[PDB]
Amino acid sequence: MKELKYDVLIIGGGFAGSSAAYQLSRRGLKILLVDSKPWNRIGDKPCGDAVSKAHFDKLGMPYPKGEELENKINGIKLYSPDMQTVWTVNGEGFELNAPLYNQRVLKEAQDRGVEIWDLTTAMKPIFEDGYVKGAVLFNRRTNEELTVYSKVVVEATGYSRSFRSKLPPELPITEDLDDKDADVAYREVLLTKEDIEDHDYLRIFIDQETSPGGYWWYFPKGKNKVNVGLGIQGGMGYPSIHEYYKKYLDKYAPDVDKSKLLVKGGALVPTRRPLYTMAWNGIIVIGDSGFTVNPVHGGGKGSAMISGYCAAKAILSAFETGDFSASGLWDMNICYVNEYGAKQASLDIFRRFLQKLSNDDINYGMKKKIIKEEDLLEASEKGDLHLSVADKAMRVISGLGRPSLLFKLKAVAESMKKIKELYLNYPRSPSSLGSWRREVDNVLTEFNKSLS
Numbered sequence: 251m252k253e254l255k256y257d258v259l260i261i262g263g264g265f266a267g268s269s270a271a272y273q274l275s276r277r278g279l280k281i282l283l284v285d286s287k288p289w290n291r292i293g294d295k296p297c298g299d300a301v302s303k304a305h306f307d308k309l310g311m312p313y314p315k316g317e318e319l320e321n322k323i324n325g326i327k328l329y330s331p332d333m334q335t336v337w338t339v340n341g342e343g344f345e346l347n348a349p350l351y352n353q354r355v356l357k358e359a360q361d362r363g364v365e366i367w368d369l370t371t372a373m374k375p376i377f378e379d380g381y382v383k384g385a386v387l388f389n390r391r392t393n394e395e396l397t398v399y400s401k402v403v404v405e406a407t408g409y410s411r412s413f414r415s416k417l418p419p420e421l422p423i424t425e426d427l428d429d430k431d432a433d434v435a436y437r438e439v440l441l442t443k444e445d446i447e448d449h450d451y452l453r454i455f456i457d458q459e460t461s462p463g464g465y466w467w468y469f470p471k472g473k474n475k476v477n478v479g480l481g482i483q484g485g486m487g488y489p490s491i492h493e494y495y496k497k498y499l500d501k502y503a504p505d506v507d508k509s510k511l512l513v514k515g516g517a518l519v520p521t522r523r524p525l526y527t528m529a530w531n532g533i534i535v536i537g538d539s540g541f542t543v544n545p546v547h548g549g550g551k552g553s554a555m556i557s558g559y560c561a562a563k564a565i566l567s568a569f570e571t572g573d574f575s576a577s578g579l580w581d582m583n584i585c586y587v588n589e590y591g592a593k594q595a596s597l598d599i600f601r602r603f604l605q606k607l608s609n610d611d612i613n614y615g616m617k618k619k620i621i622k623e624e625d626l627l628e629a630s631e632k633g634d635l636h637l638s639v640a641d642k643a644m645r646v647i648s649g650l651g652r653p654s655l656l657f658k659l660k661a662v663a664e665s666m667k668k669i670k671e672l673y674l675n676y677p678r679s680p681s682s683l684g685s686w687r688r689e690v691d692n693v694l695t696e697f698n699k700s701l702s
């Protein structure tokens with residue numbers, strides 16, 4: 251078989267892989283990125299396509315321009331199940347043409363020295379002496395099977411986790427996730443018959459009956475075009491999401507023209523803390539493959555880009571030291587936990603609480619102003635549930651005259667506090683990973699039982 255030598259092999263060219271490629275470019279490294287999809291389809295996984303502007307501003311990723319930016323976003327309207335209470339959170343963001351932006355990032359990375367092979371699948375790892383050392387690839391453009399050696403593989407295969415899942419199962423980098431720690435989500439993009447009211451605002455609709463464990467959404471892509479969809483929690487035995495969509499679409503999108511559909515599709519999305527380690531010998535995992543998605547609102551394009559930024563940093567450091575061991579690449583973990591992972595862990599707890607609340611609970615809490623709509627924004631910043639907020643919330647619901655899980659909010663805050671402390675003390679080396687992990691698992695196990 252043909253054998254090639256690269257510094258870095260990036261597997262997957264979505265927001266995660268393309269960010270890593272972009273952030274590693276113009277540095278004199280020999281980099282190959284591969285994706286199973288043809289070029290003009292790269293980036294087209296079903297998504298609501300909404301990304302906060304802050305992520306581009308902090309990472310130095312290109313702003314979306316032209317046909318890439320479908321609609322400027324100025325905030326989000328959050329709807330109670332009975333739709334009688336709406337909370338507004340203001341903030342700048344973009345409704346993207348995801349494939350068009352994604353492909354432009356890749357083409358610029360390519361112009362900046364990164365080699366790209368589309369229609370190419372990494373079929374199996376090269377693994378020897380405890381190290382990932384590359385991949386066997388099948389290039390369906392050339393109908394060639396190729397062996398590529400790399401100092402580091404960047405695993406950016408999305409939810410498929412189609413490379414790291416083929417590594418020896420004893421390795422931390424092969425960590426799987428519980429079925430209940432992901433959503434299935436489905437969306438369509440449609441034209442609308444009436445102008446879209448406040449089209450610069452996303453709409454998110456909480457409802458445990460029409461989207462159990464997730465939510466419905468209505469994300470305008472223009473004055474007369476909307477991305478509408480829902481996500482529901484996995485591992486709960488729920489019926490087909492396509493059947494939820496058909497049944498309740500009219501509730502959330504009565505204005506759409508069902509004859510003018512531009513795109514439709516679904517996929518899985520992780521909703522948990524990240525991989526306990528995103529680094530091992532000769533490999534870093536990023537994006538959905540590394541469980542980088544915000545457990546509460548399900549947004550992962552922004553955090554995918556953050557994970558690509560951290561990966562590039564750790565890899566550049568590893569080429570300085572010559573150390574591509576787990577230890578040599580460990581800054582991946584330190585960087586990612588700092589930038590988003592600790593926040594995710596806190597929100598992993600909070601998610602579990604939200605998914606157990608009833609519609610009556612959520613209607614009541616929102617109507618009684620259990621929190622300010624402004625406290626929502628502060629909490630979303632680092633995923634913190636502060637004392638004064640929790641205490642006030644408890645006083646607000648103190649008149650409620652039925653059993654409710656809302657009264658567990660104080661204990662939720664306590665568990666969030668516990669897990670945040672653990673992530674603030676992320677293991678400085680691989681040799682501490684195991685005992686730290688068991689501490690985190692114990693916090694989660696104790697929390698689960700508290701809600702049962």
Ligand SMILES: Cc1cc2c(cc1C)N(C[C@H](O)[C@H](O)[C@H](O)COP(=O)(O)OP(=O)(O)OC[C@H]1O[C@@H](n3cnc4c(N)ncnc43)[C@H](O)[C@@H]1O)c1[nH]c(=O)[nH]c(=O)c1N2
Pocket residue numbers: 261262263264265266267284285286287292293295296297298299300301370371372373406407408409410412413435436437479516517518519536537538539543548549550551552554
């Ligand atoms: C319906 C729906 C809606 C939303 C969202 C998800 C879903 C399903 N999310 C989440 C967000 O879309 C998601 O977190 C990111 O797109 C993940 O990007 P990645 O690059 O990690 O994976 P992604 O799956 O995008 O890319 C993985 C790539 O790897 C390739 N690949 C896989 N295995 C391979 C192999 N062995 N060899 C070669 N290539 C391989 C695939 O071809 C693919 O291009 C979201 N996020 C957000 O911020 N805003 C939102 O609006 C939403 N809404």
Ligand SMILES: CC(C)=CCC/C(C)=C/CC/C(C)=C/CC/C(C)=C/COP(=O)(O)OP(=O)(O)O
Pocket residue numbers: 298300301302303304323324325326339340341342343344345435467481519547548549550
């Ligand atoms: C549909 C699924 C599965 C996920 C969606 C993921 C989401 C909700 C993405 C929204 C991203 C977006 C457009 C955010 C902009 C709106 C907003 C409130 C941004 C807040 O960011 P900040 O910059 O911190 O706010 P400020 O500008 O007020 O400081």
